[PDB]
Design a protein around this ligand. Structure first.
Ligand code: SF4
Ligand code: SF4
Ligand code: SF4
Ligand code: SF4
Lengths: 435, 443
């Protein structure tokens, strides 16, 4: 896997092609939050917040002994178990994605955390850094990242084009039980200040915030292959909580090294663009970052920091050319959300950011399928050739890409965090591949 | 030819018939948690390197600070430079992010809630009613398979089930009143009885922590530490793998408790609180007790952390295992010889506690745990030399002789930072050993 990555390393420079129309994107425009897409009917035809209508379908499926849309479970007990596993997975995640910045788990300073308080006498977060060498810092922080649950880790300079212009958040003193009903918009701005700070009016990231560290958190292949049914939902959910723990662990490490760190999970900016710039993978037709190790079957989170670091090289292992002819996700998508046409700089709707060259998908169609199916779908991820274990072959001199139920999952292979020992060697790391 | 390792085969070979293997007599009473060296007034205070008497972890902090300033990764162990010393301690500190006051011991506080009702996840999911709907599965065989699958998703490297032996549940917990904020927690610790009563649900009153009489089972998880890091004991990287695994324990408990609740049962998390993990682990078949006092497992030796969840969910208990640990420990004594505090006995097992920190009435090697704790401020960490030098901690201890499996009786920090690592510090060279199919989850 390390050989594959070195082989497809490209020269420095963001591979995302942009034009002069590109503007930063307000987070409220995503299909999850925008008022034009937020409300969906349930199976009874009642208009509700999309996730409430989706809950109605989960209840309906459990009652009827189903694991998904038109997918009968072995029995009601099995149906129940899948949704219990899904719901439990989300334990360390707020309101599907931890997007409110500097709230709950996503604090921009460590000062009030119980861990920081307990460790205060050592003064690790107050002491000036003892290492400023970006080479050594990159090795340290990547080692820490792996301890913190990343299966992949990369570094990029922070491209502000992918930072949301405005965040969706809640007022600071609103407790959790009012959060869903009191969501607001708040600008994210860059200023000459020493530390990340939030005011009544603004989320302020310092101009010194040079870098972004991006983590890939691998999902389980067997469970995702059940998309759009419940076990796909469960591997999705568990990985969101793994993302949260990753962000908290790594931000604390960085702070204890004498720098600042901003967590994000699904908030603050666009993870796919950061991941491509940090060399985890390449953008794809479906819109995900496709990695050599996992294809698109991997979640992303990221941490922003002033810690000096060595940016990784972007990687090009031919995804763009492959997606050009493939279109399997587009054909299998249950909502016809994914385009079969060519890449353009023009967004198909409010949910897309115009001004960058990408495949333009209709993401309101995608979200529409979630209440209908009672899950987070994932069919595109499941059917992508890159998701399958072996797409890689060797032609004698260099690596190249090859041209060509749920009861069973519960009774089948599993290992810690859903990782697969058959492939786990692919993410082994020594100093040579960290920096 | 070398037999491909089969960890499941190994466990089958050494499976015992049913019955708690811990030998006890009439001396045995439940143990008050306040008696542990961490909490007992006789041991909680330790001098620092200036001879100032402080809480043990504060004296240990003084030594970490001194070491960083002196460019050291441990007692009389020079680091590459001050930056490396700093990094080890930053890693250690960060590892503890999801753990309260070194162990999460206060029951029904912070992360260790005995009910899910107030958790943000529960509130978010409330309209589905998973925590209100009666169980759809009561078959212990299916439940055992479901809950073990969930346990692996939740980060357990090992999982086992036992009937709950109340002998190992603390008579009284250490906790804080419910109106005390975190900042005052260490100042305001109290004792509170853990009692069993005829109630539908785990509940806490002003006077008591009440576990229902229906709380039949304990689920025990092993959380694997990283071998390379632990073998730097007593230096900083051993402290770091210890720390990260405590946060993994916490995540495990919360994940699994929520799964069980959403299956229509109740679940009590614990991490280092509520009861004695090693006893539960032995009874749930994760491994065997040892001279040093830890549960030694076939997969990781003693280099594995433990947590446990208590529940009324019907389950199939696992069988205890005997792969010869007791007999090896009788003749080995390596941990005893290498222990920097001489805390571990070189003598035979007895039923009589060495001091207040030991629970009398059960046959075990009796160690002086006040001596152990005393070395922690001296070394500026959580030591772990015993775990590091234990032959069972070594990676390739199992061999096959053509007939059966057996133990192969043949048995710096810059390099660790520059060396092999993988997700959560797990090792792909061995990760196949914890693969699981239905057959090894339930008979
Ligand atoms: S399914 Fe085919 S077109 Fe779609 S993202 Fe994967 S490789 Fe690209
Ligand atoms: S998640 Fe499902 S509906 Fe959405 S784009 Fe992928 S295949 Fe289509
Ligand atoms: S070092 Fe030897 S005596 Fe001590 S626990 Fe390990 S096997 Fe037993
Ligand atoms: S942790 Fe260290 S001091 Fe304590 S028993 Fe083990 S070797 Fe001895």
């Amino acid at each position: 896997a390390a050989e594959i990555r070195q082989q497809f390393a490209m020269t420095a420079g963001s591979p995302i092609i942009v034009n002069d129309k590109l503007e930063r994107y307000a987070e409220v425009r995503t299909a999850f939050t925008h008022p034009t897409s937020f409300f969906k009917p349930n199976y009874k035809g009642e208009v509700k917040p999309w996730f409430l209508s989706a809950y109605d379908e989960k209840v309906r499926q459990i009652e009827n002994g189903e694991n998904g849309p038109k997918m009968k479970a072995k029995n009601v007990g099995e149906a129940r178990a899948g949704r219990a596993l899904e719901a439990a997975g989300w334990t360390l995640d707020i309101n599907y994605g931890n997007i409110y910045p500097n709230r709950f788990f996503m604090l921009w300073s460590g000062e009030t955390m119980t861990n920081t308080q307990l460790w205060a006498p050592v003064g690790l977060d107050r002491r000036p850094p003892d290492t400023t060498d970006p080479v050594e810092l990159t090795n340290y922080v990547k080692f820490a990242a792996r301890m913190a649950g990343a299966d992949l880790v990369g570094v990029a300079r922070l491209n502000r084009n992918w930072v949301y212009s405005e965040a969706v958040t809640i007022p600071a003193d609103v407790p959790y039980e009012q959060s869903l009903h009191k969501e607001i918009e708040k600008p994210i701005v860059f200023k000459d200040v020493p530390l990340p700070i939030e005011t009544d009016d603004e989320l302020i990231i310092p101009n010194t915030c040079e870098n972004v560290i991006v983590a890939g958190i691998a999902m389980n292949r067997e469970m995702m292959q059940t998309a759009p049914n419940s076990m796909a939902c469960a591997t999705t959910a568990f990985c969101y909580s793994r993302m949260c723990m990753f962000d908290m662990w790594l931000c604390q490490f960085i702070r204890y090294m004498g720098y600042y760190a901003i967590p994000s999970c699904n908030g603050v900016g666009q993870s796919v663009a950061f991941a491509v710039e940090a060399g985890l993978g390449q953008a794809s037709r479906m819109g995900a970052c496709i990695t050599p190790e996992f294809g698109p079957n991997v979640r992303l989170t990221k941490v922003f920091t002033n810690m000096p670091l060595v940016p990784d090289k972007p990687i090009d292992f031919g995804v763009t050319e492959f997606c050009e002819t493939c279109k399997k996700c587009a054909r299998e998508c249950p909502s016809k959300a994914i385009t079969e046409g060519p890449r353009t700089f023009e967004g198909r709707s409010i949910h897309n950011q115009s001004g960058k060259l990408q495949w333009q998908n209709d993401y309101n169609k995608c979200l529409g399928y979630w209440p209908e199916s009672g899950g987070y779908c994932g069919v595109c991820v499941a059917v992508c050739p890159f998701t399958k274990g072996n797409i890689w072959i060797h032609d004698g001199v260099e690596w190249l890409i090859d041209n060509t139920n749920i009861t069973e999952v519960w009774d089948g292979k599993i290992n810690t965090y859903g990782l697969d020992a058959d492939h786990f060697r692919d993410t082994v790391s020594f100093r040579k591949d960290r920096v």
